[PDB]
Amino acid sequence: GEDITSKKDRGVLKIVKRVGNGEETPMIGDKVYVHYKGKLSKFDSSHDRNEPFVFSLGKGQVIKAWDIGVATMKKGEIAHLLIKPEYAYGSAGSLPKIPSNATLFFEIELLDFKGE
Ligand SMILES: COc1cc2cc(c1OC)OC[C@@H](CO)OC/C=C/[C@@H](C)[C@@H](C)OC(=O)[C@@H]1CCCCN1C(=O)[C@H]2C1CCCCC1
Secondary structure, three states: OEEOOOOOOOOEEEEEEEOOOOOOOOOOOOEEEEEEEEEEOOOEEHHHHOOOEEEEOOOOOOOHHHHHHHHHOOOOOEEEEEEOHHHOOOOOOEOOOEOOOOOEEEEEEEEEEOOO
């Protein structure tokens, strides 16, 4: 897995499973639109809801890792992310869904990204 953290502490690791298109990667503030299958090393899936997940990148509206990783994706890319708790829900955790010092995995597909 590739370390994409700025401290280089291996807190978020990434493998590209399906390569995306174009050459623009999404800027801070972009409305970004994804599918995801995700879990702790309890599985949660957008395909469960029947509906894409959407947020504004870099506004800390998701855990610190997602803003980092989804920033390194490109349209159509599917990626695998592995996340130490300091870039996820910490030593506080986020009970009941997440315990203390929980490591997390997602499969993410970046569907599209537009402009904010
Ligand atoms: C801590 O509680 C949850 C965690 C997670 C999902 C979740 C949680 O309960 C609300 O509900 C499902 C989604 C779908 O609409 O709700 C919106 C998410 C809001 C954001 C702010 C937080 C909660 O999520 C995230 O930052 C990340 C990344 C985006 C996708 C969801 N993700 C999670 O951490 C998941 C968590 C749930 C169990 C398996 C591991 C991932």
